Design a protein around this ligand. Structure first.
Ligand code: HEM
Ligand code: HEM
Lengths: 362, 361
């Protein structure tokens, strides 16, 4: 229930241990006033400082003037900080505004069309995003709700996504969670202690060619529907062939323990782990940080399940794109479909109580 | 860490309220009474396993490679997490299997209420399973696997995820707050009150339907909140809507949350005043609902609210009179009922040989 420090060279919510709950919101900007938008950014940062510490935003949830609405909507009163992190990102469409065209980073690449893509334009894109992660879903909702409220008239929510449970790990010393297909997800990720690997693969460096992004990262978000009816009638051998790990232990095929190193030649040629592995992609490596979701039924008598996939990388062109291209022949494609997509530039961290979100850009 | 599955009553009604909810309504697709009884028996065996934290059937792995696993596996390595599984039968079940004359009179259809805007697709249902647990993945895995075992005899009509408190960070006799920011549950029937449970919650044999003795009747209402509207109301408006202050949750004019309300100091259309048993001829409810937030609708608005669950000894003397009295509730300005269902929740599974529905079939 402890707090995660909000200030740093990097934003929390990336290398941070993965919290149990996600509330992800993408916003469109509805003001042309660059000065108004900057004011919003400073205001949102002040609220984030309170929220991540478990304090009410503004002057609190009650005790103000009786005839004025409370500053804080109040549903997180009495709750601990619950490891809340708030991570902000800027979509490519934002750089068409406030005369920011020349500042859009090369590494913020538009994604090409991928085979099987069936993207819903209304749950894709967005001028910016806020990733709220916490162990308590009420805490995450309260944060998004109160940010949107403060931004009323300058931003609106385009689409949002709640994840009821993580399917990723930045802490290999703790139990690896399972996704809704029943497999451990997160074994060979990048850990928050591997500061060398984070520099090489996650944080944008100054020499990369966009100085304001130094210390930031780039985020790919993909909403992926799972065909659980199809999956649930496949044999155990089929399911394990698709991945290249056994279902029970999550060990690479042929080996005994989850964390034994995969021997790719023993896997089927179209096995997910074989195709995604850095060694098959010129060393391309990703920080995976996704969550499971279910949004009711599909109206055809079945549950509707999926995975909200999130990846952080130093350069979308050298991270997500090569690996996703290599999955064109993935055996997993038979059981999933990508139905939403968006990319963001995640700026550097808020360095101290004088700094603010996006200060290096504006 | 676990809640016993067997008893005179089903668990998940008087037992401690768990942090998360996965509620699913099912429609029945078979006409064959025997095939349905067989499914009820299979479901009971699976529920025994799930509530103890074990996989269904012969497990999630280690079986014959050319066979699909009995259990879909996403709860491997998790704990029982206080999972309870509570089944109920909707009025429409009784049009099948020759059961028409066994429908309890207390399982009454709900009137249309002023301001209802009920989504047909998220209403009704031949039966329900309420899955409560401290880990949402444990609850989802239970619904996912019962549906799979039932495939071909039942389909999922609608499903709802909900959250209450998070018990790892929140003390347990701290009242949870709803998404309007007000404490919710202060004056409620507690699981410790055996006498009030008998008076108000459990069906008795003299009520008229012997096979329902020890069961209860369930009303589910999906209630959307107009969040953005609520959040623009003054603090005084919000407190006047309920008749309690927002910070402490004390009845107006009182000092503490648990001070008994003085109804005459509340506005005549305040929610607590209209819902209180003294304003409804003594009618008293066991509320056991959960908040929901499903995302955002087409207008950028927050799709969130209260998934209201009330258990009672007779719908006609429980939910119906109280809800009728809310016709003029000041709260109506900020909420809308958009889904509804009622269910007869049978008596408990007595022992290892018993099964869900045995007293009816
Ligand atoms: C529903 C969609 C997906 C599911 C169920 C899934 C499942 C898995 C599983 C079970 C593993 C093995 C354990 C681990 O090392 O984490 C894995 C590994 C991995 N996945 Fe996926 N995955 C999905 C989508 C994706 C996508 C879209 C990408 C990249 C575009 C990706 C990239 C990777 C990578 C890089 C690894 C680590 C391979 C290694 O280095 O050993 N996955 N995935
Ligand atoms: C979004 C919908 C609703 C919200 C936010 C809400 C909220 C509240 C709040 C804050 C209280 C006072 C604290 C407490 O004793 O629990 C309360 C009391 C109560 N409510 Fe509601 N309520 C809702 C719907 C309903 C409905 C539909 C019913 C019945 C049909 C109902 C019946 C009651 C009862 C019986 C009490 C106890 C009053 C007393 O005995 O002091 N509520 N509710």
């Amino acid at each position: 229930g402890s707090a995660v420090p909000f200030h740093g060279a990097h934003q929390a919510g990336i290398a941070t241990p993965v919290q149990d709950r996600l509330h992800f919101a993408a916003f469109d900007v509805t003001t042309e006033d660059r000065a108004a938008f900057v004011a919003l950014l400073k205001e949102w940062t002040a609220a984030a400082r309170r929220l991540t510490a478990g304090h009410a935003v503004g002057e609190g949830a009650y005790g103000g003037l009786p005839e004025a609405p409370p500053d804080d909507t109040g549903e997180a009163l009495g709750l601990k900080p619950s490891r809340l992190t708030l991570t902000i990102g800027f979509g490519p469409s934002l750089f068409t505004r406030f005369g920011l065209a020349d500042l859009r980073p090369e590494a913020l690449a538009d994604l090409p069309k991928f085979p099987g893509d069936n993207l819903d334009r209304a749950r894709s894109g967005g001028d910016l995003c806020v990733q709220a992660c916490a162990d308590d879903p009420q805490v995450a909702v309260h944060a998004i709700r109160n940010l949107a409220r403060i931004g009323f008239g300058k931003v609106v929510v385009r689409w949002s996504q709640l994840g009821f449970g993580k399917t990723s790990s930045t802490t290999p010393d703790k139990q690896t969670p399972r996704n809704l297909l029943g497999f451990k997800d997160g074994t060979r990720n990048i850990a928050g202690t591997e500061k060398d690997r984070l520099d090489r693969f996650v944080w944008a460096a100054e020499k990369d060619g966009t100085p304001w992004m130094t210390g930031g990262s780039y985020l790919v978000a993909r909403r992926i529907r799972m065909h659980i009816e199809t999956w649930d009638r496949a044999s155990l051998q089929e399911q394990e062939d698709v991945f290249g790990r056994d279902k029970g232990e999550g060990a690479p095929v042929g080996k005994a323990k989850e964390r034994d190193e995969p021997f790719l030649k023993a896997m089927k040629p179209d096995a997910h782990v074989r195709l995604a592995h850095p060694d098959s992609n010129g060393g391309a490596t990703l920080l995976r940080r996704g969550y499971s979701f279910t949004d009711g039924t599909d109206g055809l008598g079945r549950l509707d399940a999926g995975l909200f996939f999130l990846a952080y990388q130093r350069d979308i062109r050298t991270g997500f794109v090569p690996v996703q291209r290599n999955l064109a022949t993935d055996a997993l494609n038979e059981y999933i479909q990508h139905v939403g997509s968006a990319v963001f530039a995640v700026p550097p961290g808020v360095r101290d109580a004088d700094d603010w979100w996006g200060s290096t850009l504006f």
